[PDB]
């Protein structure tokens, strides 16, 4: 129950439960498959 009118006044947000490290761990242009050779 929100007792207040504005959105800033609500409690903390709830877990992204998004999670996708590939923008950080695999930003390569041509896709690399694990097990296939790195450099062909």
């Amino acid at each position: 129950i929100n007792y207040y009118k504005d959105a800033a006044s609500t409690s903390s947000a709830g877990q992204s439960l998004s999670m996708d490290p590939s923008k950080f761990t695999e930003p390569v242009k041509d896709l690399m498959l694990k097990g296939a050779p790195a450099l062909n």
Partner: protein, 273 residues
């Protein structure tokens, strides 16, 4: 969810453990690519590492102090701490600072808690309950000059009155001018040759001003204000390397000269355990 699957002997032409790090990727290698594993489940979600959780607890961001005393003959209230202010900023106290600067841009609502406690250094009598007034003074608003100016009327400016010993709490929406707050800014406010460099130019969010509403009693009373800040509804972009050297200034990246080696030297060889 499985944390590890079962995997047995391998004799392949398909080697997942040989890679080329020059590419910039961190290939997702697992225990089961190089030893024989058994199934195990995660039993865990990663709840407490969510950025909302990481930045979402109150941190002390500022400690100031004001006193209640006879202003009779004081030529400069501000200077007597008859009231004081604070040039709002979140980078002055450095525990919360290292946490935020793990990101480049950050967006969130703030919840402030203000604790005010009183001290009577000079042996005293009866302390009459002091009421603090915290008022937000945004950029381009009549800054207050005495502890009882017309400014304190605060007819258009949000102000909270609470008692010393108590706590005040309220929450302010994300007031940034852009889409996010810059944790870093490699720019200037304009292309002058001598203008300051950093964020300080970017982060002029105005100051907050405190005073006691009470007139003076016979003794003097020191009131020390602690401002706590909790981020709620957090959004963070672009992770960066954590801060290694100590901080020297609000808003610049500068570290102190003749600082000490930050990497612990081995007591022994490279070969040592």
């Amino acid at each position: 969810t499985v944390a590890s699957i079962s995997s047995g002997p391998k004799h392949t032409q398909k080697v997942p453990i040989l890679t080329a790090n020059e590419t910039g990727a961190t290939m997702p290698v697992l225990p089961s690519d190089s030893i024989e594993t058994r199934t195990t489940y995660m039993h865990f979600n990663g709840s407490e590492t969510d950025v909302e959780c990481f930045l979402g607890r109150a941190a002390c961001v500022h400690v100031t102090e004001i006193q209640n005393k006879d202003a009779t003959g004081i030529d400069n209230h501000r200077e007597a701490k008859l009231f004081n202010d604070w040039k709002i900023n979140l980078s002055s106290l450095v525990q919360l600072r290292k946490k935020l600067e793990l990101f480049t841009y950050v967006r969130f609502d703030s919840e402030y808690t203000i604790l005010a406690t009183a001290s009577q250094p000079d042996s005293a009598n009866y302390s009459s309950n002091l009421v603090v007034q915290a008022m937000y003074v945004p950029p381009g608003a009549p800054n207050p000059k005495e502890w009882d100016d017309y400014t304190w009327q605060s007819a258009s400016n949000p102000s909270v009155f609470f008692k010393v010993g108590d706590t005040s709490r309220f929450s302010v929406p994300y007031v940034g001018l852009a889409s996010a707050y810059n944790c870093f800014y490699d720019g200037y406010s304009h292309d002058d040759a001598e203008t300051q460099y950093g964020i300080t130019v970017l982060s002029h969010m105005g100051s907050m001003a405190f005073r006691i509403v009470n007139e003076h009693d016979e003794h003097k009373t020191l009131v020390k204000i602690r401002v706590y800040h909790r981020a709620k509804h957090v959004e963070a972009w672009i992770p960066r390397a954590p801060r290694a050297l100590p901080y020297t200034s609000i808003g610049r990246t500068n570290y102190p000269k003749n600082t000490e080696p930050v990497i612990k030297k081995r007591k022994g060889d490279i070969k040592s355990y």
